[PDB]
Design a protein around this ligand. Structure first.
Ligand SMILES: Cc1cc(CN)no1
Ligand SMILES: Cc1cc(CN)no1
Ligand SMILES: Cc1cc(CN)no1
Ligand SMILES: Cc1cc(CN)no1
Lengths: 135, 135
């Protein structure tokens, strides 16, 4: 019955049904939740992961439309810290999958969510291209 | 103060920020609304408008995640009729722009919403392609 604060982070570039279902899963981990979503910065995403198609402001403006999202931290830190969870009063971190998150699991704050295959924005474009026979 | 029922329809293929902002605008036409969204069928869209990338079930499953959407009619009729508005107790139709909708305007039920340029799913893919210098 008590409200529980859930945190999920990510790039959310070219937002698709796969992202949305993962956000839904985080939102519904418990009966009464606040879902905070962290959106990674342009510079850190590009440095550590890869080039982003959409700027931070665009990625965040799109997430704002998703039913499950209660609060957005934009930009969020690239690495989650215990101090960050205390500052935002976060009870659990929802995420995929030396295990950079061993400390979240040891703390009881790790909640796994699943990715959906085949539904990404690039997947849709691949379906378009497959309409043109190569020969 | 009284709740007002708003109807918007469309294909909602490869849902993007442009769709989301138009749905937000329809939802916020009045202080207290129910937003019903109609999603066109595969066959009728292909016959009258063009080939859809995503099947009806996929397009609807994606709209379900949008904050502004209260009810979805999937599939919806291709042409809105007065009987349809009475059946679903629809007060206003939100839409773009011999004027097929003269009768909605004459009835006081036409509410214009605006499209946003530059934010479509294909626009994003064009931005990716523009990263590869032609030479
Ligand atoms: C925080 C945060 C999220 C991601 C997504 N790979 N990286 O850092
Ligand atoms: C509340 C609450 C948080 C946890 C995990 N640290 N258990 O209960
Ligand atoms: C109804 C309905 C919506 C559309 C979108 N062009 N066509 O019919
Ligand atoms: C309520 C309501 C609907 C209209 C338009 N027919 N005016 O008030």
């Amino acid at each position: 019955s008590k409200n529980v604060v859930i945190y999920a982070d990510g790039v959310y570039d070219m937002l698709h049904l796969g992202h949305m279902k993962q956000l839904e899963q985080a939102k519904k981990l418990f009966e009464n939740t606040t879902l905070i979503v962290g959106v990674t910065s342009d510079n850190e995403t590009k440095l550590f992961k890869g080039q982003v198609v959409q700027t931070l402001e665009e990625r965040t403006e799109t997430l704002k439309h998703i039913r499950w999202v209660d609060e957005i931290i934009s930009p969020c830190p690239w690495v989650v810290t215990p101090e960050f969870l205390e500052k935002y009063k976060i009870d659990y971190v929802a995420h995929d999958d030396e295990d950079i998150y061993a400390w979240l699991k040891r703390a009881g704050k790790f909640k796994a969510t699943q990715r959906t295959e085949g539904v990404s924005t690039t997947d849709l474009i691949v379906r378009i291209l497959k309409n043109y026979e190569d020969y």
